[PDB]
Design a protein around this motif. Structure first.
Motif, PDB file in Angstrom:
ATOM      1  N   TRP A   1       0.802  -1.193   0.000  1.00  0.00           N
ATOM      2  CA  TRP A   1       0.000   0.000   0.000  1.00  0.00           C
ATOM      3  C   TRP A   1       0.842   1.252   0.000  1.00  0.00           C
ATOM      4  O   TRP A   1       0.362   2.328  -0.302  1.00  0.00           O
TER       5      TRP A   1
ATOM      6  N   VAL B   1      -0.795   3.146  -2.952  1.00  0.00           N
ATOM      7  CA  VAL B   1      -1.757   4.208  -2.755  1.00  0.00           C
ATOM      8  C   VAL B   1      -1.270   5.497  -3.413  1.00  0.00           C
ATOM      9  O   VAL B   1      -2.066   6.244  -3.978  1.00  0.00           O
TER      10      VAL B   1
ATOM     11  N   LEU C   1      -1.838   5.056  -7.147  1.00  0.00           N
ATOM     12  CA  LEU C   1      -3.220   5.161  -7.585  1.00  0.00           C
ATOM     13  C   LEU C   1      -3.551   6.629  -7.739  1.00  0.00           C
ATOM     14  O   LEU C   1      -4.367   6.983  -8.567  1.00  0.00           O
TER      15      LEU C   1
ATOM     16  N   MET D   1      -0.097   8.404   4.940  1.00  0.00           N
ATOM     17  CA  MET D   1      -1.290   7.840   5.532  1.00  0.00           C
ATOM     18  C   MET D   1      -1.017   6.369   5.806  1.00  0.00           C
ATOM     19  O   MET D   1      -1.362   5.881   6.877  1.00  0.00           O
ATOM     20  N   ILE D   2      -0.358   5.682   4.879  1.00  0.00           N
ATOM     21  CA  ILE D   2      -0.106   4.271   5.088  1.00  0.00           C
ATOM     22  C   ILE D   2       0.906   4.126   6.215  1.00  0.00           C
ATOM     23  O   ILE D   2       0.658   3.422   7.193  1.00  0.00           O
TER      24      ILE D   2
ATOM     25  N   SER E   1      -3.361   8.738  10.754  1.00  0.00           N
ATOM     26  CA  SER E   1      -3.490   8.240   9.402  1.00  0.00           C
ATOM     27  C   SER E   1      -4.766   8.798   8.777  1.00  0.00           C
ATOM     28  O   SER E   1      -4.789   9.094   7.591  1.00  0.00           O
ATOM     29  N   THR E   2      -5.818   8.962   9.570  1.00  0.00           N
ATOM     30  CA  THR E   2      -7.079   9.440   9.047  1.00  0.00           C
ATOM     31  C   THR E   2      -6.988  10.909   8.658  1.00  0.00           C
ATOM     32  O   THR E   2      -7.830  11.418   7.931  1.00  0.00           O
TER      33      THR E   2
ATOM     34  N   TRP F   1      -5.530  10.921   5.240  1.00  0.00           N
ATOM     35  CA  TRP F   1      -6.553  10.507   4.301  1.00  0.00           C
ATOM     36  C   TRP F   1      -7.375  11.715   3.859  1.00  0.00           C
ATOM     37  O   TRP F   1      -7.663  11.901   2.683  1.00  0.00           O
TER      38      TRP F   1
ATOM     39  N   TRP G   1     -11.306   3.215  -0.928  1.00  0.00           N
ATOM     40  CA  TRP G   1     -10.372   3.505   0.139  1.00  0.00           C
ATOM     41  C   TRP G   1     -11.048   3.516   1.497  1.00  0.00           C
ATOM     42  O   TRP G   1     -10.359   3.598   2.502  1.00  0.00           O
TER      43      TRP G   1
ATOM     44  N   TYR H   1     -10.756   0.028   3.658  1.00  0.00           N
ATOM     45  CA  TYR H   1      -9.541  -0.435   4.293  1.00  0.00           C
ATOM     46  C   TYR H   1      -9.490  -0.022   5.763  1.00  0.00           C
ATOM     47  O   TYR H   1      -9.012  -0.776   6.597  1.00  0.00           O
ATOM     48  N   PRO H   2      -9.969   1.162   6.165  1.00  0.00           N
ATOM     49  CA  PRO H   2     -10.111   1.489   7.579  1.00  0.00           C
ATOM     50  C   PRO H   2     -10.965   0.548   8.418  1.00  0.00           C
ATOM     51  O   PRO H   2     -10.984   0.671   9.639  1.00  0.00           O
TER      52      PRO H   2
ATOM     53  N   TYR I   1      -8.927  -2.122  10.072  1.00  0.00           N
ATOM     54  CA  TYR I   1      -8.175  -1.568  11.174  1.00  0.00           C
ATOM     55  C   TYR I   1      -9.067  -1.433  12.408  1.00  0.00           C
ATOM     56  O   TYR I   1      -8.583  -1.543  13.522  1.00  0.00           O
TER      57      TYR I   1
ATOM     58  N   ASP J   1      -8.591  -5.430  -2.350  1.00  0.00           N
ATOM     59  CA  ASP J   1      -7.493  -5.270  -3.279  1.00  0.00           C
ATOM     60  C   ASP J   1      -7.940  -5.709  -4.659  1.00  0.00           C
ATOM     61  O   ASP J   1      -7.580  -5.081  -5.634  1.00  0.00           O
TER      62      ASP J   1
ATOM     63  N   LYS K   1      -8.171  -2.716  -7.493  1.00  0.00           N
ATOM     64  CA  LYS K   1      -6.960  -2.672  -8.289  1.00  0.00           C
ATOM     65  C   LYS K   1      -7.247  -3.199  -9.685  1.00  0.00           C
ATOM     66  O   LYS K   1      -6.653  -2.753 -10.646  1.00  0.00           O
TER      67      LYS K   1
HETATM   68  C1  LIG Z   1      -4.561  -1.045  -3.419  1.00  0.00           C
HETATM   69  C2  LIG Z   1      -4.544  -0.604  -1.993  1.00  0.00           C
HETATM   70  C3  LIG Z   1      -5.191   0.471  -1.461  1.00  0.00           C
HETATM   71  C4  LIG Z   1      -6.015   1.406  -2.253  1.00  0.00           C
HETATM   72  C5  LIG Z   1      -5.074   0.690  -0.050  1.00  0.00           C
HETATM   73  C6  LIG Z   1      -5.654   1.662   0.709  1.00  0.00           C
HETATM   74  C7  LIG Z   1      -5.498   1.848   2.050  1.00  0.00           C
HETATM   75  C8  LIG Z   1      -6.038   2.880   2.807  1.00  0.00           C
HETATM   76  C9  LIG Z   1      -6.777   3.930   2.048  1.00  0.00           C
HETATM   77  C10 LIG Z   1      -5.869   2.889   4.201  1.00  0.00           C
HETATM   78  C11 LIG Z   1      -6.347   3.809   5.107  1.00  0.00           C
HETATM   79  C12 LIG Z   1      -6.161   3.817   6.559  1.00  0.00           C
HETATM   80  C13 LIG Z   1      -6.747   4.815   7.259  1.00  0.00           C
HETATM   81  C14 LIG Z   1      -7.169   6.117   6.640  1.00  0.00           C
HETATM   82  C15 LIG Z   1      -7.010   4.762   8.742  1.00  0.00           C
HETATM   83  C16 LIG Z   1      -6.608   3.454   9.409  1.00  0.00           C
HETATM   84  C17 LIG Z   1      -5.332   2.952   8.819  1.00  0.00           C
HETATM   85  C18 LIG Z   1      -5.388   2.714   7.299  1.00  0.00           C
HETATM   86  C19 LIG Z   1      -3.924   2.615   6.831  1.00  0.00           C
HETATM   87  C20 LIG Z   1      -6.029   1.338   7.048  1.00  0.00           C
END
Ligand SMILES: *C/C=C(C)/C=C/C=C(C)/C=C/C1=C(C)CCCC1(C)C
Ligand SMILES: CCCCCCCCCCCCO[C@@H]1O[C@H](CO)[C@@H](O[C@H]2O[C@H](CO)[C@@H](O)[C@H](O)[C@H]2O)[C@H](O)[C@H]1O
Ligand SMILES: CCCCCCCCCCCCO[C@@H]1O[C@H](CO)[C@@H](O[C@H]2O[C@H](CO)[C@@H](O)[C@H](O)[C@H]2O)[C@H](O)[C@H]1O
Ligand SMILES: CCCCCCCCCCCCO[C@@H]1O[C@H](CO)[C@@H](O[C@H]2O[C@H](CO)[C@@H](O)[C@H](O)[C@H]2O)[C@H](O)[C@H]1O
Ligand SMILES: CCCCCCCCCCCCO[C@@H]1O[C@H](CO)[C@@H](O[C@H]2O[C@H](CO)[C@@H](O)[C@H](O)[C@H]2O)[C@H](O)[C@H]1O
Ligand SMILES: CCCCCCCCCCCCO[C@@H]1O[C@H](CO)[C@@H](O[C@H]2O[C@H](CO)[C@@H](O)[C@H](O)[C@H]2O)[C@H](O)[C@H]1O
Ligand SMILES: *C/C=C(C)/C=C/C=C(C)/C=C/C1=C(C)CCCC1(C)C
Ligand SMILES: *C/C=C(C)/C=C/C=C(C)/C=C/C1=C(C)CCCC1(C)C
Ligand SMILES: *C/C=C(C)/C=C/C=C(C)/C=C/C1=C(C)CCCC1(C)C
Ligand SMILES: *C/C=C(C)/C=C/C=C(C)/C=C/C1=C(C)CCCC1(C)C
Ligand SMILES: CCCCCCCCCCCCCCCCCCCC
Ligand SMILES: CCCCCCCCCCCCCCCCCCCC
Ligand SMILES: CCCCCCCCCCCCCCCCCCCC
Ligand SMILES: CCCCCCCCCCCCCCCCCCCC
Ligand SMILES: CCCCCCCCCCCCCCCCCCCC
Ligand SMILES: CCCCCCCCCCCCCCCCCCCC
Ligand SMILES: CCCCCCCCCCCCCCCCCCCC
Ligand SMILES: CCCCCCCCCCCCCCCCCCCC
Ligand SMILES: CCCCCCCCCCCCCCCCCCCC
Ligand SMILES: CCCCCCCCCCCCCCCCCCCC
Ligand SMILES: CCCCCCCCCCCCCCCCCCCC
Lengths: 282, 282, 282, 282, 282
Positions: free
Chosen positions: B101, B105, B108, B137-138, B164-165, B168, B205, B208-209, B212, B235, B239
């Protein structure tokens, strides 16, 4: 006096986790870079293809180095209690960088001279002096950092490190002289970019000596982590960053030649979404 | 308070079986995506090739991550009765996603801006702010989820998760602003698709939170399975799905330029078995 | 009632030797199909490249599944006498097929519709319904065969197997409807081939349910051998055989368009050493 | 009399660190060379493509050999104190070179004759005598150095070494005769380069017999290090160096033919940044 | 009577060393062949591309087989005293060849018919009879040599060997009939080469039955070495040698068609440094 080596440091799991992140991030970013290199390899003229070839070597050698290192990381530390303890393959998480740099630092020098205005055989004197000087600078580091004293000798780091610093000065004075000659004979737009690419390369190279000072001065898992983070980061910035900058210069020069009659390119050249040159048929 | 980590949970053989399915399905689907990317890479103009390059990075990095993860799965849990019990290499079935990521990310974001109508200082400012914001953010997630507290600290998940938020919000406000500027200056047909691709990315996106939150709130092999299923599924959708949507936009824009004189494409562009543009010679 | 699973059987050395031959003959034949697919990918136009892309994934995912299954055969059984006795990595000589089929069966459906005459809402509706239906048919098999009773439950094989059989009927009724619509609107020569390719695909798919009946009814190393032989053979026939049949149709259609003005192809199309169309320049 | 073999010596850590460096440097440099070969493969005419094919074989075989050797190095010595004691897989850090040389030395001979002026029948006599003579020279070395006596017999090194030296004389007298015939019938500019490439190849080949004298005369970890350093260095110089020199000759000859009407090349040919020939259409 | 199998013999270090040489030499030479195939794949018309596809399969399957075998060699024998003693994975140093031959012998038959003058559907009868006959000949060998009796049964070698010899006669009578029909309808120059390529293939195939007689008659490490040497050598000669001879025929035929109007080739064809045909544009 003696200093523990960087691979003779027990790592906490916050240290172990960071180290795996950055090793794996660096290998990843250089496999992107390799892909990018191949996909964009026809934007450049055959006059300037040496730049593509250099950059492809830089990305392949470095990607392999980083795979080795990530696999040695998994098999180089044994977790005992809450702390990861280095075994004999822990040196293989650090040493393999010197092999990468041995090829890359010479190839970065070649890539830079690729897009300068040196031609024929006085070019060849400069390319050889550069490739020599670069190779000798890394190898003399390897000997101080890994081979003589086993990484654990302060006098061997300071002697072989000083020697490496002399081949740095020699290599950088050759390149900076070559570029200073070229800038007059390029076009204003390219000369500008070639100055900047020269400042970005020399500046990048000044970061790597700092990892070597840590090894002399500080020993610990904090510091073994600091070394890997510094060196990984610098590889990403200086090998993605710089190799994209030379490609713009190759493209801009390719297009300038197209526009001028010197040659013909199959595709159009678009740099920053501005068309530099049109496609043409023999 | 303390929470067990996700890789510290014993898996039943139904849980172990699902987890291997989805890991292996995701790596498979992203190797298809990589192949597709290569085979269709000449449908797009050189003006829009940044889109191809992005997508190729996204697919390579992700495919490798998933291979690592599938190999760590085999060597990360030991069958001790009716349960698969985690070894010390079971962090490596989860952690490697953050490396993927970290590259993807940002890429993308680059792919999305590839097909927008941004040029000048504002383009480069926007690409850098995006790549920074995305990367930050990641990485701030990695620190909460893997590094600080060892995945086992609720306060460290909530602090690093909140941080991280914020990146975002910053990254999404940059991209959505860039796109809102472009839609006026595209053609109606492309503007439509670029709006949809923006909604599909931002929406992807938000999934993915949720993985977490599970890690904060629920611990168990059910939930370690839920995490992998959620993240693997997302994913594949985001993707394969999104990177095919930007390619339509690149193609449609390529063709629009062909039709307009801006450039010439060697092959014809077909978009839904509808010919958009004819082949042409310089 | 309970049945032993297929990977819980002790194989003789005749049984062990035939299972490695068939597993390694299937990965070898699907690496020839990957090479054939890339070498012969410019014989088809760009209106019908969705077929080259589908076949390249069907052959990349399938070869990767068979390398894993051949590597897990070497490390999944231990010779303890005149018998090879299963370990805990023996499920990985069977389960990885479901991952392959999860990508491939959807992609085979896409490849078939590639060369049909669908466009509009009905095209996208049909491609999605097919990809869904196909994916759901495999996944519901996986759950019966591998996940829910651990492969050892007759009721779980019969319930999840019946459910899978419903998504077979749904997927096949969608495809056969799509093709029945197209045959009128193709040329006689292509319509003929598209009918045959449809009969060859549906017929191939009827073989795979028989491996699943064995698992319900018969347990033994004879039968574990029978399963692998059946499934390996069927993969070779239906993935080499069918993906060569669609390529003829793509080529014939490509040529028909060349001849008609619809487009221009760089090479000539020779099908059966008979020239279908000449090379042309934009 | 008996001599210990080169893989039967206990290496210090400085000797292991050097040996790993050079093995890994050589494999790296030959993967660069492989990449370079591919990227520049269209600068040469189809009349001269045998040169590209040779060079690609030389780089592939050698790269693989060196990977094998680097992996055998990791698993061929065990650290038992301040020394790395040889395992039974330490013969595999030395023996695999003979396999490389078995393909390469014949292919280097083919590459050299590629750009000479031989007919196509009397050519065949020369190409076969060369490939035979070259292959026989290596294989008779292998037998002395590895197979008969187990590397530990001085009489077997001197007999099989002398025999190998006879096939060296025979192979070199064939090549030098072929080239002496060609130089008159080339152009002055190419004849010059072909003389130099001949001197560079024969001279390179004289280094490799010295590694074999060490094995006869001196035994120790110093000397096992000396052998690897010598042989690694010579592979880099004589496979990067020489295979770039033949490529210039192929390019120059390709261009000479373009200029003369003999053929037409799609790209222009730039050698030392001087356009040798322009691009052309059939 | 019971004969020990070939993988049940303790090898000396000379016999272990030779076996590793030849296995590694054969895999090397077939990776060269694969590279060659790719680099020269555009010298041939699209009418004759089946020849390229065949040859690429032959080289891929065989290269993989030989990698497997070289890796099984390292992990199939244990050095105990002065002898290498076979473990249970020593059978994987011999068995994997039957998988290679299962794909290749059919593909060699296809490659030969590629350049003959059979067209349409009577072609198809001959291609299928050949591919069947070839496949059945290998598989019936596998059963005698590996599966039934475990390689240790003289009666099972003689029965399954005799059966295999019948499919040899059937396959060879089909091919020789096909070629005898073609030679009249080729041009004199090609007919000559197609006769020779037929004699070279059939003659090559007569060597492989001799490895099978050794297994019946003689058991020992000498003889296990003899088997591998014979079979490795024959693979190099018959897969490098023959697949280069069919490529000349494809090229010569391609050029003959160019000269005649039948088609147009982008590059010129040079065979033995004699221009057969010029480059052309649609
Ligand atoms: C292909 C992979 C992608 C698009 C991954 C995206 C991941 C995120 C947008 C993660 C966001 C997060 C937050 C905003 C808060 C909590 C922690 C994360 C890293 C999961
Ligand atoms: C830590 C992880 C960070 C990972 C993200 C790295 C971001 C850098 C990648 C961006 O790489 C991007 O490449 C494209 C080439 O396709 C370049 O773009 C340039 O060349 C393309 C190629 O035809 C032209 O269409 C375009 O007009 C021109 O701007 C961009 O100038 C560069 O910014
Ligand atoms: C669980 C995972 C299962 C995954 C199944 C596969 C998912 C769907 C993949 C389909 O991917 C498909 O790619 C082809 C690429 O040629 C695209 O096709 C597009 O390009 C081709 C090639 O120029 C044009 O002929 C065509 O008009 C256009 O639609 C399709 O729009 C897309 O639907
Ligand atoms: C059990 C394992 C046995 C394995 C055997 C596998 C081999 C059988 C498949 C051979 O696959 C073969 O591929 C070539 C691909 O060029 C096809 O050939 C087709 O394309 C070429 C290339 O433009 C055309 O010149 C030709 O007119 C057309 O027939 C053949 O129709 C097919 O028979
Ligand atoms: C033990 C292992 C030793 C291995 C040695 C192998 C020797 C043969 C390898 C090279 O084999 C050689 O390939 C080249 C391929 O371009 C062929 O060359 C042919 O094609 C090229 C390329 O269009 C033409 O320039 C040339 O006119 C023509 O002869 C030769 O006819 C063949 O003899
Ligand atoms: C110890 C390890 C050190 C490793 C260093 C290895 C790098 C040195 C070799 C550099 O290799 C370099 O390749 C390029 C390939 O484009 C060659 O460049 C040649 O081809 C290009 C491409 O058409 C032409 O523009 C150019 O006129 C011509 O010189 C250079 O002549 C050579 O110097
Ligand atoms: C992509 C990798 C690059 C550019 C690596 C660069 C490395 C250096 C410029 C290293 C320099 C050193 C000194 C001049 C002194 C101390 C030792 C070294 C090798 C770190
Ligand atoms: C290349 C692989 C292919 C075409 C695989 C096909 C698999 C099927 C069509 C499987 C069907 C099944 C049923 C309809 C019922 C029982 C369970 C399955 C999954 C075997
Ligand atoms: C790229 C590798 C090359 C050019 C290798 C060359 C090797 C030789 C020319 C070896 C010659 C030998 C003798 C003539 C005598 C002693 C034994 C040998 C094999 C080292
Ligand atoms: C590249 C590999 C080739 C051409 C392999 C050929 C193998 C044969 C022609 C084998 C023939 C056999 C018999 C006819 C009888 C004994 C058993 C066999 C399989 C060795
Ligand atoms: C350490 C920084 C060195 C800067 C070198 C570049 C400056 C000169 C550029 C060419 C004139
Ligand atoms: C923590 C270590 C990270 C090091 C990152 C790499 C440093 C590269 C510095 C580049 C400087 C560029 C200057 C360009 C000036 C143009 C005017
Ligand atoms: C406890 C906190 C530890 C955090 C360590 C992180 C170090 C970050 C270094 C810079 C990262 C830049 C990466 C660019 C690719
Ligand atoms: C079981 C959890 C799996 C989550 C998959 C989520 C996939 C991403 C969602 C995309 C939403 C698209 C919305 C498009 C609007 C136009
Ligand atoms: C016990 C039942 C377990 C079922 C697991 C289902 C997980 C959700 C499936 C998501 C399908 C989309 C994948 C692309
Ligand atoms: C026991 C293994 C089964 C192998 C064969 C599987 C494929 C069968 C395909 C049937 C094709 C029928 C074509 C009708 C037209
Ligand atoms: C492509 C493969 C075609 C089918 C191969 C043969 C299928 C049956 C295998 C039977 C082997 C067992 C014989 C024991 C006596
Ligand atoms: C001691 C390490 C090995 C020596 C380095 C390799 C030497 C290559 C052979 C020399 C080349 C001579 C070139 C003469 C050209 C006129
Ligand atoms: C103290 C160890 C010194 C090793 C010297 C090795 C020979 C010089 C380096 C040659 C590099 C070739 C590229
Ligand atoms: C030790 C066994 C090695 C066998 C080598 C391969 C035999 C190939 C025979 C080819 C015969 C050529 C006939 C040409 C006809 C004119
Ligand atoms: C004592 C060693 C015997 C080796 C026999 C060699 C057989 C021929 C090699 C040809 C390789 C091509």
């Amino acid at each position: 006096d003696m200093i523990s080596a960087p691979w003779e440091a027990s790592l906490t799991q916050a240290e172990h986790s960071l180290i795996f992140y950055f090793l794996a991030l660096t290998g990843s970013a250089l496999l992107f870079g390799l892909a990018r290199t191949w996909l964009t390899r026809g934007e450049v003229g055959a006059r300037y293809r040496t730049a593509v070839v250099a950059r492809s070597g830089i990305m392949i050698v470095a990607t392999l180095s980083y795979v080795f290192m990530v696999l040695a990381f998994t098999s180089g530390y044994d977790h005992v209690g809450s702390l990861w303890v280095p075994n004999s393959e822990a040196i293989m998480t650090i040493a393999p960088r010197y092999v990468e740099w041995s090829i890359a630092v010479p190839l970065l020098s070649i890539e830079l001279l690729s897009v300068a205005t040196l031609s024929g055989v006085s070019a060849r004197r400069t390319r050889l002096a550069a490739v020599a000087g670069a190779f000798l600078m890394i190898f003399t580091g390897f000997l101080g950092a890994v081979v003589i004293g086993d990484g654990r000798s302060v006098g061997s780091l300071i002697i072989w490190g000083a020697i490496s610093t002399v081949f740095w000065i020699i290599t950088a004075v050759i390149l900076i002289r070559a570029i200073r000659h070229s800038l007059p004979q390029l076009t204003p737009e390219a000369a500008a970019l070639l100055k900047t690419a020269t400042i970005f390369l020399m500046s990048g190279w000044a970061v790597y000596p700092l990892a070597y000072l840590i090894q002399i001065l500080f020993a610990g898992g904090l510091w073994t982590t600091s070394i890997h983070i510094i060196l990984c980061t610098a590889d990403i910035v200086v090998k993605l960053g710089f190799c994209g900058l030379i490609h713009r210069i190759a493209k801009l020069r390719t297009a300038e030649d197209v526009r001028a009659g010197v040659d013909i390119h199959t595709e159009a050249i678009w740099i920053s979404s501005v068309k530099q040159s049109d496609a043409g048929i023999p």
